[PDB]
Design an enzyme around this catalytic site. Structure first.
Site, mmCIF file in Angstrom:
data_model
loop_
_atom_site.group_PDB
_atom_site.id
_atom_site.type_symbol
_atom_site.label_atom_id
_atom_site.label_comp_id
_atom_site.label_asym_id
_atom_site.label_seq_id
_atom_site.Cartn_x
_atom_site.Cartn_y
_atom_site.Cartn_z
ATOM 1 N N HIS A 41 0.809 -1.220 0.000
ATOM 2 C CA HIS A 41 0.000 0.000 0.000
ATOM 3 C C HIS A 41 0.851 1.283 0.000
ATOM 4 O O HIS A 41 0.308 2.377 0.197
ATOM 5 C CB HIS A 41 -0.976 0.002 1.181
ATOM 6 C CG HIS A 41 -0.320 0.141 2.520
ATOM 7 N ND1 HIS A 41 -0.034 1.365 3.085
ATOM 8 C CD2 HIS A 41 0.080 -0.791 3.419
ATOM 9 C CE1 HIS A 41 0.529 1.181 4.265
ATOM 10 N NE2 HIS A 41 0.609 -0.118 4.492
ATOM 11 N N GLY A 143 3.422 5.679 9.906
ATOM 12 C CA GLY A 143 4.710 5.477 9.279
ATOM 13 C C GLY A 143 5.480 4.269 9.760
ATOM 14 O O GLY A 143 6.624 4.077 9.333
ATOM 15 N N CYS A 145 4.600 1.154 9.164
ATOM 16 C CA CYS A 145 4.410 0.037 8.248
ATOM 17 C C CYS A 145 5.732 -0.330 7.589
ATOM 18 O O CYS A 145 6.559 0.536 7.291
ATOM 19 C CB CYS A 145 3.372 0.394 7.185
ATOM 20 S SG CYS A 145 1.674 0.431 7.784
HETATM 21 C C1 LIG Z 1 1.719 2.218 8.260
HETATM 22 N N1 LIG Z 1 2.558 3.155 8.048
HETATM 23 C C2 LIG Z 1 0.362 2.357 8.986
HETATM 24 C C3 LIG Z 1 0.553 2.030 10.478
HETATM 25 C C4 LIG Z 1 -0.735 2.054 11.330
HETATM 26 C C5 LIG Z 1 -1.172 3.521 11.431
HETATM 27 C C6 LIG Z 1 -1.240 3.889 12.938
HETATM 28 N N2 LIG Z 1 -0.957 2.654 13.661
HETATM 29 C C7 LIG Z 1 -0.668 1.625 12.793
HETATM 30 O O1 LIG Z 1 -0.394 0.480 13.196
HETATM 31 N N3 LIG Z 1 -0.702 1.578 8.294
HETATM 32 C C8 LIG Z 1 -1.941 2.078 7.837
HETATM 33 O O2 LIG Z 1 -2.182 3.277 8.025
HETATM 34 C C9 LIG Z 1 -3.070 1.235 7.117
HETATM 35 C C10 LIG Z 1 -3.121 1.429 5.558
HETATM 36 C C11 LIG Z 1 -4.064 0.475 4.752
HETATM 37 C C12 LIG Z 1 -3.741 -1.009 5.026
HETATM 38 C C13 LIG Z 1 -4.011 0.739 3.239
HETATM 39 N N4 LIG Z 1 -4.395 1.537 7.704
HETATM 40 C C14 LIG Z 1 -4.866 1.351 9.026
HETATM 41 O O3 LIG Z 1 -4.097 0.875 9.846
HETATM 42 C C15 LIG Z 1 -6.275 1.715 9.505
HETATM 43 C C16 LIG Z 1 -7.429 1.516 8.741
HETATM 44 C C17 LIG Z 1 -8.720 1.870 9.195
HETATM 45 C C18 LIG Z 1 -8.978 2.461 10.452
HETATM 46 C C19 LIG Z 1 -10.354 2.861 10.981
HETATM 47 C C20 LIG Z 1 -11.452 3.201 10.143
HETATM 48 N N5 LIG Z 1 -12.695 3.567 10.551
HETATM 49 C C21 LIG Z 1 -12.974 3.634 11.876
HETATM 50 C C22 LIG Z 1 -11.963 3.323 12.791
HETATM 51 CL CL1 LIG Z 1 -12.368 3.423 14.493
HETATM 52 C C23 LIG Z 1 -10.689 2.947 12.351
HETATM 53 C C24 LIG Z 1 -7.799 2.661 11.204
HETATM 54 C C25 LIG Z 1 -6.507 2.310 10.757
#
Ligand SMILES: *C(=N)[C@H](C[C@@H]1CCNC1=O)NC(=O)[C@H](CC(C)C)NC(=O)c1ccc(-c2cncc(Cl)c2)cc1
Lengths: 303, 303
Positions: A41, A143, A145
């Site tokens: 991603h 960040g 990831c």
């Molecule tokens: C990587 N850099 C990052 C790390 C995470 C962000 C903060 N803590 C982590 O562990 N990964 C992401 O941001 C991923 C990206 C996707 C896989 C393309 N997304 C999420 O971790 C995430 C998705 C959805 C929610 C969410 C949505 N609606 C309601 C709620 Cl309560 C939560 C949260 C986080």
């Protein structure tokens, strides 16, 4: 003596961490030989992550859309492919700090060390366990990831986890180094719930043995129990069942302490039904389940 | 999100661990530039450690009695001296992996990472706090002496601890890198007891600020207190008094939450006088006291 949550020394993995940038988004990558591994991603904009068609987005990139930095040295990307949720970037120089390594997929209840990184720079290291519901209770921020989990056997690093996302309950989900998620999760920006978690029973018993090796014995009793009668109570309290293989693996700790495994099961059965009465075990008010029998033996062998 | 005891990445320190042998006695040493630092009781036989005269033993040794090894590679000793309880060995090779570094003496309540080493080989890394009674609740086995504790700011390693001893109660004692013991202990194989320990107040306060930052704030009141009144009451509960510097390092967390330090103190004073009432703070029924204000800041901000 003493008992602490212990991680493997992170040095061999630190020499492999790099920064990977595609457009506006930056995360960590793992540089082994002439290949950099990172979550796919990274090729997403903020809009793409909502419902990304990854194969579409990938075919619309070329090598020059990928900025890889090792320290202040930019590495030239000369190839790219995608294996499940992991993007693989071929570079023109092999990592001189590549250790002996292998890619493994761990089982629930097994532990590993996590090297939390940001912008390709290591921030900290801590010990985690793969939960029965295939989450991990880590500590990850924006960040993070591309951070990897691992174990070290002699001088070989077994990479088992790459971090991808956080769940609404605050727990974390990721993949092995082949890009396959642990658990029923997907790399979308959507709220995802895990299955109801359970407690890793064989780890709790190993930690009870560690508590006795370090002098804490108030929870011991003289009830006995069959393996089945213990597993009946365990499942009632959302504990994973104990296998005969689990019983055999606890053998060395049983021998060291002179406490039969099923006698330790009787002690644990009483704790589940009575509680800790406000007492503590190794300074914990809760039964700890993120120490494997191997982790306990490694720390307590030779009392 | 997520909250965990985190160690610093240990790579910079792993590259400085060596093995020091005198006769049959082998422990760990710290190789920085062209000097190796290790506990001085490496020059002791098992019978010597009962009542050792260290300079009587030292003057009977010369450079060629010391075996210093990095791996299987021997580093020739070209000079030696004793500074307090630490032996310094000048070698003919400057460590090409020497990081930017500093020797510090930490205060009780301050935390650090420990790289547990055996035969000069790093085996694990964990997080520790210097207790008010100048012991650490660590995890050490035979041959672990010379393992070091450290913090890392920027790329500068601040070395603060070197391991010497285990006490009867299972806690551990050592020196700073200038050889001065923390607490009133001595490197002699005699019965020494640690004083009665107390709770690190400044760290409990930091952990209360961490709870507030995460929306868990039921324990706040409208009361305030003086620093003097709080310290007098806190000693009644086995809590350390707050120093000038303690108030000063709580500043950032005080500014982030808008809660004055003396108001958080008045909040902790109620929790001590009234108890916890079966309620929770950051998921725990126990107050945590091995996270400094810096640990809280760095883990809710990333580094
Ligand atoms: C990587 N850099 C990052 C790390 C995470 C962000 C903060 N803590 C982590 O562990 N990964 C992401 O941001 C991923 C990206 C996707 C896989 C393309 N997304 C999420 O971790 C995430 C998705 C959805 C929610 C969410 C949505 N609606 C309601 C709620 Cl309560 C939560 C949260 C986080």
């Amino acid at each position: 003596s003493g008992f602490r949550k212990m991680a493997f020394p992170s040095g061999k993995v630190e020499g492999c961490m790099v920064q990977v940038t595609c457009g506006t988004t930056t995360l960590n990558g793992l540089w082994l030989d002439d290949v950099v591994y990172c979550p796919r991603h990274v090729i997403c904009t903020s809009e793409d992550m909502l419902n990304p068609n990854y194969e579409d987005l990938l075919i619309r990139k070329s090598n020059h859309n990928f900025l890889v930095q090792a320290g202040n040295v930019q590495l030239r990307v000369i190839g790219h492919s995608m294996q499940n949720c992991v993007l693989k970037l071929k570079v023109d120089t092999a990592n001189p700090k590549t250790p002996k390594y292998k890619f493994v997929r761990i089982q629930p209840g097994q532990t590993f060390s996590v090297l939390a990184c940001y912008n390709g720079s290591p921030s900290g290291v801590y010990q985690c366990a793969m939960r029965p519901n295939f989450t991990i209770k880590g500590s990850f921020l924006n960040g993070s990831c591309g951070s990897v989990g691992f174990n070290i056997d002699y001088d070989c690093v077994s990479f088992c986890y790459m971090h991808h996302m956080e769940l609404p309950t605050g727990v974390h989900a990721g993949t092995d180094l082949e890009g396959n998620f642990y658990g029923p999760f997907v790399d979308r920006q959507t709220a995802q719930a895990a299955g109801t978690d359970t407690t890793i029973t064989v780890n709790v018993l190993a930690w009870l043995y560690a508590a006795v090796i370090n002098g804490d014995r108030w929870f011991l009793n003289r009830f006995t129990t069959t393996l089945n009668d213990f597993n009946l109570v365990a499942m009632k309290y959302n504990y994973e069942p104990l296998t005969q293989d689990h019983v055999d693996i606890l053998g060395p700790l049983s021998a060291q302490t002179g406490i039969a495994v099923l006698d330790m099961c009787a002690s644990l059965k009483e704790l589940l039904q009575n509680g800790m009465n406000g007492r503590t075990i190794l300074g914990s008010a809760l039964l700890e389940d993120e120490f494997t029998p191997f982790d306990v033996v490694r720390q307590c062998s030779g009392v």
